[PDB]
């Protein structure tokens, strides 16, 4: 992020909920390290805009 | 049988080889563990 | 690729160069900082 404009930066994502995988690459992690919440019994989500 | 090449493949059964601290192919694992009731679940895997 | 001239232009990526205290082109900056939530706003600029 040099002057006024942005060099190349991009904000987009997706998730791997997959069992068994080292994760960190070149010292840094993916961005976070969490174990399974063991999801929804009778909950849901309300999507707005 | 005898092999002069190969990717990743494990095998058990026969034996005369002596687990040499120099080379035991890769790693060695002795005995059969799991009892009767011991159930096991396995995952797919893959990294990166 | 290789350059024998130039104005002001930065670049990252490859590397074999050793940040020599004599000349490291101009200045050096290691690692990637910003986490996930860290948002950044930039301005136009210009002086005088």
UniProtKB/Swiss-Prot annotation, chain A:
Sequence intervals crossing the membrane: none
Start and stop residues of the MVP repeats: 1-35
PTM remark: Phosphorylated on Tyr residues after EGF stimulation. Dephosphorylated by PTPN11.
Subcellular location: Cytoplasm; Nucleus
Subunit text: The vault ribonucleoprotein particle is a huge (400 A x 670 A) cage structure of 12.9 MDa. It consists of a dimer of half-vaults, with each half-vault comprising 39 identical major vault protein (MVP) chains, PARP4 and one or more vault RNAs (vRNAs). Interacts with TEP1. Interacts with PTEN and activated MAPK1. The phosphorylated protein interacts with the SH2 domains of PTPN11 and SRC. Interacts with APEX1. May interact with ZNF540.
Domain remark from Swiss-Prot or TrEMBL: MVP 3 mediates interaction with PTEN.
Free-text function comment from the UniProt entry: Required for normal vault structure. Vaults are multi-subunit structures that may act as scaffolds for proteins involved in signal transduction. Vaults may also play a role in nucleo-cytoplasmic transport. Down-regulates IFNG-mediated STAT1 signaling and subsequent activation of JAK. Down-regulates SRC activity and signaling through MAP kinases.
UniProt protein name: Major vault protein
Lineage: Eukaryota, Metazoa, Chordata, Craniata, Vertebrata
Swiss-Prot record, chains B, C:
PTM per Swiss-Prot/TrEMBL: Phosphorylated on Tyr residues after EGF stimulation.
Transmembrane segments: none
Subcellular location: Cytoplasm; Nucleus
Disulfide bond sites: none
Highest taxon listed in the record's lineage: Eukaryota
Role, per record: Required for normal vault structure. Vaults are multi-subunit structures that may act as scaffolds for proteins involved in signal transduction. Vaults may also play a role in nucleo-cytoplasmic transport. Down-regulates IFNG-mediated STAT1 signaling and subsequent activation of JAK. Down-regulates SRC activity and signaling through MAP kinases.
Free-text domain note: MVP 3 mediates interaction with PTEN. MVP 4 mediates interaction with PARP4.
Subunit-structure text: The vault ribonucleoprotein particle is a huge (400 A x 670 A) cage structure of 12.9 MDa. It consists of a dimer of half-vaults, with each half-vault comprising 39 identical major vault protein (MVP) chains, PARP4 and one or more vault RNAs (vRNAs). Interacts with TEP1. Interacts with PTEN and activated MAPK1. The phosphorylated protein interacts with the SH2 domains of PTPN11 and SRC. Interacts with APEX1. May interact with ZNF540.
Protein name (record): Major vault protein
Stretch of the intact protein here: 135 to 182 of 861
């Amino acid at each position: 992020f040099d002057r006024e404009g942005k060099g190349r930066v991009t904000g987009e994502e997706w998730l791997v909920r997959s069992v068994g995988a080292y994760l960190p690459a070149v010292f840094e992690e993916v961005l976070d390290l969490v174990d399974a919440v063991i999801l929804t019994e009778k909950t849901a989500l309300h999507l707005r805009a | 049988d005898k092999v002069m090449a190969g990717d990743e493949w494990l095998f058990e059964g026969p034996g005369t080889y002596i687990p040499q601290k120099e080379v035991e192919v890769v790693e060695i694992i002795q005995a059969t563990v799991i009892k009767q009731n011991q159930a096991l679940r396995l995952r797919a895997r893959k990294e990166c």
